[PDB]
Design a protein around this ligand. Structure first.
Ligand SMILES: *[C@@H]1O[C@H](CO)[C@@H](O[C@@H]2O[C@H](CO)[C@@H](O[C@@H]3O[C@H](CO)[C@@H](O)[C@H](O)[C@@H]3O)[C@H](O)[C@H]2NC(C)=O)[C@H](O)[C@H]1NC(C)=O
Ligand code: UPG
Ligand code: JM3
Ligand code: CA
Length: 283
């Protein structure tokens, strides 16, 4: 149990760029802590964060009882860069899983900055991966009225997948030991570097890459309840949702904070609690 003592029982990493995504990142962290008594450590992709966020994180850590660490990893010069900040951030989620964390960490979970956690994240740590270096929840099929927007159900993806699930990259558990054993980081970087020579390829960089590689870098398909997003998932399955992603709805184009307040009743509770912690530190 070197990993649990040197780090924590639950290790979550996330990426956030912008005050809005940093405001949601604090909410995500509070939601994790309200649903677990296991030790938690949050790991942040440091260079995207504002100076205010990095100043506030020790206050969140002391109030909620978690450890944290800033990871500053530099994009290798050989590896095809991303001009768009959104795509650069996606690259940080999926391309460096073997080099961002210390070798003494055996497991890490990516949880999106805009997520609301309603479960003990140690259940994901304990989830059997059957030898897969990582596990992702599938994209919901349950909201039948959104079938026209499920690009992965027809065209190039339906032919490529051969019936395999097209997984959502909002949440994923990485068994770092197995990822290292399989050199999945080196292989993901190489396939990304070859694929990205075509600027039309990997439209959803962080999502398309592990879905493309799932025949050779296995994905343990997580239970559907691990990731619920209103765009693709039915209202009836929300009560089972372990975590919620505020994923974009191509039909309604509803703003981010509106989706948060409308779908998640405890969202303002976390937002106000974190704002109350900020006014308590300020005075
Ligand atoms: C984190 O740890 C706390 C403290 O152990 C957990 O709270 C405890 O949860 C149990 C299970 O619900 C409670 O026991 C039961 O409580 C009900 C309601 O009073 C009572 O009718 C039953 O007879 C039984 O005693 C326990 O009271 C409660 N303790 C406190 C201080 O709230 C909490 O559930 C843990 N959270 C996680 C995510 O593990
Ligand atoms: O830190 C961030 C993240 C996103 N955005 C912007 O927000 C917009 C929409 O992105 P986002 O809110 O991330 O969309 P989601 O639908 O929530 O993203 C889903 O789909 C992405 C891949 O397409 C995955 O990376 C996510 O985990 C998954 O939730 C874009 O302009 C992003 O550049 C930011 O400004 N800052
Ligand atoms: O490795 C791949 C990369 C990109 C795409 C297409 N993208 C552009 C439109 O949105 C979906 C993702 C693929 C489609 C099918 C199979 N493999 C793919
Ligand atoms: Ca999201």
């Amino acid at each position: 149990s070197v990993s649990k003592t040197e780090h924590a029982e639950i290790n979550i990493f996330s990426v956030a760029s912008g005050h809005l995504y940093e405001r949601m990142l604090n909410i995500m962290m509070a939601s994790v802590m309200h649903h677990t008594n296991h030790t938690v450590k949050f790991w942040f992709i440091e260079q995207f964060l504002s100076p205010s966020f990095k100043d506030f994180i020790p206050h969140m850590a002391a109030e909620y009882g978690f450890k944290y660490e800033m990871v500053t990893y530099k994009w290798p010069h050989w590896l095809r860069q991303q001009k768009e900040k959104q795509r650069e951030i996606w690259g940080y989620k999926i391309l460096f899983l073997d080099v961002l964390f210390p070798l003494s960490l055996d497991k890490v979970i990516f949880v999106d900055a805009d997520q609301i956690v309603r479960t003990d994240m140690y259940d994901l740590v304990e989830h059997p991966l059957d030898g897969a270096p990582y596990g992702f929840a599938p994209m919901c099929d349950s909201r039948v009225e959104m079938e026209g927007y499920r690009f992965w159900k027809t065209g190039y993806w339906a032919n490529y997948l051969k019936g395999k699930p097209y997984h959502i990259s909002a949440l994923y558990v990485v068994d770092l030991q197995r990822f290292r054993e399989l050199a999945a980081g080196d292989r993901l970087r190489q396939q990304y570097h070859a694929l990205s020579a075509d600027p039309n390829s990997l439209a959803n960089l962080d999502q398309d890459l592990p879905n493309h590689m799932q025949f050779t870098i296995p994905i343990a398909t997580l239970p559907q309840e691990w990731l619920w997003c209103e765009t693709w998932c039915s209202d009836e399955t929300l009560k089972d949702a372990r975590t919620i992603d505020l994923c974009n709805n191509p039909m309604t184009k509803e703003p981010k904070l509106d989706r948060a307040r409308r779908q998640v009743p405890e969202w303002t509770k976390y937002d106000e609690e974190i704002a109350e912690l900020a006014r308590r530190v300020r005075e």
